[PDB]
Amino acid sequence: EAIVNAQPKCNPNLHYWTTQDEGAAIGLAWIPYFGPAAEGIYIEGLMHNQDGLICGLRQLANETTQALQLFLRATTELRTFSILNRKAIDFLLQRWGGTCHILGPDCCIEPHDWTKNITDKIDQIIHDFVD
């Protein structure tokens, strides 16, 4: 589906917080004894509404809520950390969960170079058909 923002307003800027994912730690700062407290583990970034991404993001999260809430009703886990790993697994199963029928619509195999390795090397058997 497409994302139609249907909210009263949109803050077109996302001033965000998160944890560090890239970059080596400065000396001993990685050691929990020496490192920052809970308040000081965050980084920030600022994102503008290029491609209408920020406003779509707000709408996406709004639309996610129903499915997400129903999922949480059906789980007995108190805290759920596995949603993204499960999506990765489903990503793989959608593609590789059965037999990959080559040139079928549901099989992500490209024989492009393998076509012009076989059809190109016919000219070392029909071209070299020397009498």
Partner: protein
């Protein structure tokens, strides 16, 4: 029940990844490309004043609380921190579970202390949204723990594409989470202001400033409640936006005009 949407970018636009169709062009090379994300209700234009915000929450029994995690969030202007008891002194909200900390970026923390009937085991969001804590989104409010209202999204990304100030604002409350809820903004433990929906955080901090400097605090053991007249004004969201007032004393109520 229905499949949880996953956000993906096609044709320079965010879209819900269509479950029934397979796009081999889409590439997930690593589980880092997957992200879970918290967006605040603020950014959709909702009223963030305490009176309007609290009317969105309500007590309910029979529903176990649920928690889901998120990796990144949005800096808030408005967060809330509730210390609500029954009139018999028993706590209305549960202690924060182990590992649940307050929302990390709040410009204003609206700390509401007070009382109400609390007709239910847990306090939920009436509109189905989440209480966002530090990288954990819960279906319910925990006691004395700072939260932003918000909702959660999940994304597949591609592979290539000033400090922090916080001010606490304190409120007394009676009849919390009912049709007749009365709020009071706190100047000090004996000086208060009758709250209204139209008052912004910055107006409250200026009104406070004006009370302290003009010398309009309670100079007795008694409680002092300043009312503001309707003429003193205060439809623009936060991200797109002196000594003239006169105070006179009419518990001990009063007016500011």
């Amino acid at each position: 029940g229905r499949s949880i949407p996953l956000g993906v970018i096609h044709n320079s636009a965010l879209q819900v990844s269509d479950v029934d169709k397979l796009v081999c062009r889409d590439k997930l090379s690593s589980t880092n490309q997957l992200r879970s994300v918290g967006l605040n209700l603020e950014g959709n234009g909702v009223a963030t004043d305490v009176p309007s915000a609290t009317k969105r929450w309500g007590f309910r029994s029979g529903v176990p609380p649920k928690v889901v995690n998120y990796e990144a969030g949005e800096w808030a202007e408005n967060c809330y921190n509730l210390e609500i008891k029954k009139p018999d002194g028993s706590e209305c909200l549960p202690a924060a579970p182990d590992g649940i900390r307050g929302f990390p970026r709040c410009r204003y923390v609206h700390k509401v202390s007070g009382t109400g009937p609390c007709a239910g085991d847990f306090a939920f969001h009436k509109e189905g949204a989440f209480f966002l804590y530090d990288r954990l989104a819960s279906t319910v409010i925990y006691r004395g723990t700072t939260f932003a209202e918000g909702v959660v999204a999940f994304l597949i990304l591609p592979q290539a594409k000033s400090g922090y100030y916080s001010t606490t604002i304190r409120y007394q409350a009676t009849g919390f989470g009912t049709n007749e809820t009365e709020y009071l903004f706190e100047v000090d433990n004996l000086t208060y202001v009758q709250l209204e929906s139209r008052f912004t955080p910055q107006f409250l901090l200026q009104l406070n400033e004006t009370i302290y400097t003009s010398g309009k605090r309670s100079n007795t053991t008694g409680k002092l409640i300043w009312k503001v007249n309707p003429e003193i004004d205060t439809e623009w969201a936060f991200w797109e936006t002196s000594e003239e007032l006169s105070f006179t004393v009419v518990x001990x109520x009063x007016x500011x005009x």
